[PDB]
């Protein structure tokens with residue numbers, strides 16, 4: 001068993017409703033107001049073919065930028081310098097206020113929610129995961145600290161290969177409802193997480209999407225809120241965002257913390273703005289100055305042995321669900337496959353959002369091009 | 385085979401993407417911007433316990449109205465007199481701008497889209513369904529006219545029993561993605577519709593949700609648009625609505641025309657306002673004066689043999705996806721199970737929206753109470 005989880009609605013039985021029960025009482029009072037959480041659904045637009053190009057005062061320094069964005073399958077691109085939007089691009093067919101899947105940029109949002117609860121003293125990063133989720137006893141998460149989950153420093157038998165059909169990340173996806181279930185698959189994400197094993201070693205970076213969903217599980221046990229609600233209460237609702245975000249949910253209503261958030265480019269930039277404002281958002285403080293400082297400082301360099309990342313960023317690292325380049329600008333970024341970045345450039349007090357759809361989840365080729373653009377744009381923002 | 389259908393995106397292969405392919409190119413450029421159409425998803429609120437009660441100047445005439453609304457499991461209630469909102473109620477936990485499933489009030493929206501295309505001469509109601517959807521040859525829809533589909537005057541072996549697990553409406557639901565698929569089930573709604581049979585007789589009213597999805601299929605073949613887009617272009621985008629509507633979609637992206645639309649109470653009222661404005665919406669004409677006149681006039685009384693409806697409304701009838709009471713006020717209503725009404729009161733130039741979640745889909749008990757409220761409210765709007 002995976003223990004207590006936040007009910008889908010007040011008074012709901014465990015795991016209710018399902019796809020087969022949402023029409024029945026008492027579930028239907030909730031379900032009729034939230035049907036998209038149960039059944040795939042399309043928007044019917046209240047509004048009645050060409051790219052929107054407003055690259056502003058970086059266009060002069062980067063004359064070929066639009067072509068570079070097209071070449072990296074850019075859907076939305078936005079540069080926020082201070083509080084001002086100084087450059088924007090949206091491909092034909094993608095509206096400025098359309099939402100876009102964040103993939104693992106989602107992780108950086110989850111880490112932020114954890115940070116809030118650390119500030120409140122409700123989570124102690126030094127404590128074992130099992131202090132908050134006892135039911136992970138006997139799994140690879142039995143022993144490691146919450147900080148080691150935050151920093152992805154746990155050795156896990158989990159192949160995070162995004163193309164291999166046999167990998168654990170595929171099984172993770174089926175458990176999350178991202179793909180069709182196979183016979184024998186875990187019922188939900190919680191169950192899937194309890195199946196994970198490892199050799200027991202910690203301290204070396206291993207990127208694993210399971211870690212983030214463990215963090216969200218911790219958030220749920222500490223707050224009693226569905227992760228979907230926690231993400232709103234502790235982060236999204238404080239941003240004064242233009243639109244709601246969305247997040248995929250599995251059959252229990254558990255939001256896919258590791259990869260399933262969608263939002264507008266402009267609203268994602270508000271998260272970066274909060275980070276560069278020492279953790280304060282328009283409607284109140286989100287996380288502490290100390291938490292932000294620790295994110296910007298980076299993780300242990302020794303732990304970071306991922307040659308892909310370090311080939312580009314020799315002094316790079318990872319902490320608290322953020323990638324830290326350790327470059328001369330000390331850039332830090334949320335990163336998702338197929339070209340998603342929430343990129344922070346503290347030197348110029350700027351945030352760059354790039355949301356894309358590369359044909360491949362991740363290759364050195366796309367990595368090189370994507371980071372080349374983000375660095376060139378950052379530098380174009382420097383005083384001259 | 386069910387023939388040509390509108391592609392999910394420009395250039396998409398038939399039936400693509402599926403739950404198992406949306407992450408792959410070329411699908412992912414579209415899917416990353418529309419993931420809720422593939423995977424169940426929750427809203428993450430941008431906004432940070434008690435009912436909202438603003439019953440205005442009908443409260444005096446109906447002092448017990450709030451209790452009557454509670455007793456009929458009312459989630460949202462709104463009265464529009466002319467252009468003015470004169471009464472509103474929303475239950476605790478349901479916000480004024482929350483969306484609510486319409487169930488078969490959805491049908492009246494679909495009929496409106498058909499009406500637009502009849503006005504344009506792109507659909508001739510006198511023509512057989514097969515003039516527009518040849519692939520329905522050999523089915524119960526081989527022979528009947530489009531008008532007979534609009535008026536639900538086709539005898540079909542289809543048990544529209546909302547509680548019986550064995551009924552065709554359940555199989556319809558599985559084909560639409562509302563419930564878990566069983567082995568042997570049709571792949572999608574189009575395929576399901578082609579399996580339907582009947583004795584060949586027409587002319588007598590038989591309420592059947594399959595009819596509305598046939599109408600949406602016709603709309604798609606005539607316009608080349610996904611029904612989701614047709615519903616927006618021909619209706620929703622002309623209303624100047626506060627919010628997008630949503631509609632559930634099956635595995636091909638086909639919107640559930642018969643039951644799957646959700647929207648706010650205030651926005652649904654804009655549809656009624658359009659009907660009482662002779663078919664004109666704020667952003668342009670939706671349907672012709674003649675179409676609206678024919679809806680308000682009612683269908684053939686002889687055809688209406690449903691004792692449930694006629695027990696309450698002896699002179700009642702059905703036409704063009706609207707229920708017509710034939711009462712002394714000539715009230716006409718869209719109706720959905722569990723207590724959804726888009727109720728028109730032309731006498732007072734008023735629209736009443738009631739969106740509910742009765743524990744039962746439909747019983748004489750709820751029917752009596754619901755119609756009692758709508759009639760009392762209508763009468764309270766009369767000059768005195």
Ligand SMILES: NCCCCCC(=O)NCCCCCC(=O)O
Pocket residue numbers: 103104105162169173209258259306308309335336337362367
């Ligand atoms: N199919 C599920 C996908 C879950 C999201 C995974 C994701 O976005 N991962 C980001 C990996 C970035 C790697 C950065 C680097 O190695 O340089």
Ligand SMILES: NCCCCCC(=O)NCCCCCC(=O)O
Pocket residue numbers: 487488489546553557593642643690692693719720721746751
């Ligand atoms: N489980 C799928 C439900 C599809 C919607 C059906 C629906 O809303 N039907 C309305 C029936 C109204 C009957 C009115 C009357 O008989 O008085």
